[PDB]
Amino acid sequence: GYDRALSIFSPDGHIFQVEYALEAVKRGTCAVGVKGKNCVVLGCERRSTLKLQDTRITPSKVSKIDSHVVLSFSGLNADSRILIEKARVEAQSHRLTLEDPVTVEYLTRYVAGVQQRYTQSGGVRPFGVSTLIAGFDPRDDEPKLYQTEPSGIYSSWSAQTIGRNSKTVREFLEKNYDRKEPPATVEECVKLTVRSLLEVVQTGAKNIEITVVKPDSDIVALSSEEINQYVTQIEQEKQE
C-alpha cells in the first residue's frame, strides 16, 4: 500500500498540505449559512460561465444528510461527495444503534473527524473542502449551524460564510447580524442571506440557490421565481 506521509510539519510549524487545501476552499464557489429564531437558511453561489447547463440533473450544492440535517460546502466538488456519502452512512448507522437520529453537533463532529484523519494518515491528502452543516436536533426547536474545515476543527456559528470572496460577505454579516435579535421569521432570514450573497454574486438570476430548513424535518428548496422576488425587492429598497 502507498504509505507516504504527504501531510507533514514544516520548520515554522505549519502543515502546508492542510493550508493548501484551504486555498482550494478559497477558490470554490461561495456558500453562506444564516440561522434565525426558528430556522436556518443555506445560500450558495453558482458561477455563470456555464450556460447550456441542465439544472434538473446537475448535482445540487446543498445535500440532505438525513431528513433533518443538510450539508453545503465550498471547494473541490469531487471531494465533497466522499464526505457526504460517509456522513449519510453514519446518519443511518446512528439511527440503527442509538434508535435516534443524529444531533447536528454529532454529525458535524463525525465529518470533522474524517477530515482530521486525512491530515495524519499515510498515502492520502487532506480534503480540499470546508462544510456548513445545518439542521435541528430530534424533538428540538433550537436552530443549529456548524462549520468544518480541512484541518478538522469545527465550531458553531450564529451566521457564517465560506468560499471565494467569503471575507467580503463575512464583513457584511458581522455588522448586519444582531446576536440579541436574530431574524424572527423565515422571510427575514432568507432576505438577509440573499442580501449577503448579492454583495459578491453578480446577477440574482440562476446564480443563487437557497435552501430553507425548519424544525421536524421540514426542508425545502426555493425555485428561480421565488428567489428572484427577493432580488427584485432588495434592489428597489437599495435605490434610496
Binding site: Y2, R4, L6, F16, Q17, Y20, A21, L22, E23, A24, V25, K26, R27, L50, K51, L52, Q53, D54, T55, R56, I57, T58, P59, L76, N77, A78, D79, R81, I82, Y118, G123, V124, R125, P126, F127, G128
Partner: protein, 244 residues
C-alpha cells in the same frame, strides 16, 4: 530508499490545485473533439477521430463512442486505453445494479460511481489519475434524456449541450449560439456536425474521420433505441445536411 523517486501524484500546489489533475486536463485538450447535444425527443453523440490514415479499417473500428448498456452510451476524449479500463468497470456496475434491483441503472448513479473512482486516484494510492473525459448520453424513466460529463478530477456536471477534448472553448460558444430548448433530434444532428465542421483542425470534415450515435425513442412505442452509425450512414447524413 524509494522516497527519492516518488512523484507524489496526489498532493496540493501552494495555490490549492491538484498538479496531476491539471496536467491530465492539458492532455485531454489535445484529443479529438467530442460533442453531446440533448434534444426533447433524443440525444446526439458526435466525435472526431484523431488524424486518420487512408489504410485504417474504418467500419470495424471503435475509438470514441462506446456502449455501456442498452440505454446509456459514452463519448471518449483522452487516452483510449485508460477509458476502456473505466468502461468495463461501468459496464459491470450497470449489471450489478440490474442483478440487485431488477431495474436498469439510473444514469446519474452510474456516472457518480465512475466519477468516484476517478476521485480516489487524486486523493490516495500514489498513482497517476486517468487521462480521460467522458460525455455520458443516456435515458431512464426518472429524468428522461440526460447528458453528463466527468473529468480526471472526478467531478461531474449535467448539460443540455456540451463538448470535450480539443477546441471546447470555440465549440461551446457555437453551441450556446444556436441551441434552443424545443429542439428536435434531426436538428441536433445538424448542429453537432456543423459545430465539428467549424472547430475541426482538418481541412474538410469527411465520413471517414467521424463517429456518430443517436439515442432516440424512435423505436416502436415507449422504448429507447441506440444507433451507432455505420460509415455509409455517416456519409449519407453528411450529404443530407449539405456539408459534402
Amino acid at each position: 530508499g524509494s522516497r527519492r523517486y516518488d512523484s507524489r501524484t496526489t498532493i496540493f500546489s501552494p495555490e490549492g490545485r491538484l498538479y496531476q489533475v491539471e496536467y491530465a486536463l492539458e492532455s485531454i485538450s489535445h484529443a479529438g473533439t467530442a460533442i453531446g447535444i440533448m434534444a426533447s425527443d433524443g440525444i446526439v453523440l458526435a466525435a472526431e477521430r484523431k488524424v486518420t490514415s487512408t489504410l485504417l479499417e474504418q467500419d470495424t473500428s471503435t475509438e470514441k463512442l462506446y456502449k455501456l448498456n442498452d440505454k446509456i452510451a459514452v463519448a471518449v476524449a483522452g487516452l483510449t486505453a485508460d477509458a476502456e479500463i473505466l468502461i468495463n468497470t461501468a459496464r459491470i456496475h450497470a449489471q450489478n445494479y440490474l442483478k440487485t434491483y431488477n431495474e436498469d441503472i439510473p444514469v446519474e448513479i452510474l456516472v457518480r460511481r465512475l466519477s468516484d473512482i476517478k476521485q480516489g486516484y487524486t486523493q490516495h494510492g500514489g498513482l497517476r489519475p486517468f487521462g480521460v473525459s467522458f460525455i455520458y448520453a443516456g435515458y431512464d424513466d426518472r429524468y428522461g434524456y440526460q447528458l453528463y460529463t466527468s473529468n480526471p478530477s472526478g467531478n461531474y456536471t449535467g448539460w443540455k449541450a456540451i463538448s470535450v477534448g480539443a477546441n471546447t472553448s470555440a465549440a461551446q460558444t457555437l453551441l450556446q449560439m444556436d441551441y434552443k430548448d424545443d429542439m428536435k433530434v434531426d436538428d441536433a444532428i445538424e448542429l453537432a456536425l456543423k459545430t465539428l465542421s467549424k472547430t475541426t483542425d482538418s481541412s474538410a470534415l469527411t465520413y471517414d474521420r467521424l463517429e456518430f450515435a443517436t439515442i432516440r425513442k424512435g423505436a416502436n412505442d415507449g422504448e429507447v433505441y441506440q444507433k451507432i452509425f455505420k460509415p455509409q450512414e455517416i456519409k449519407d447524413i453528411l450529404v443530407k445536411t449539405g456539408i459534402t
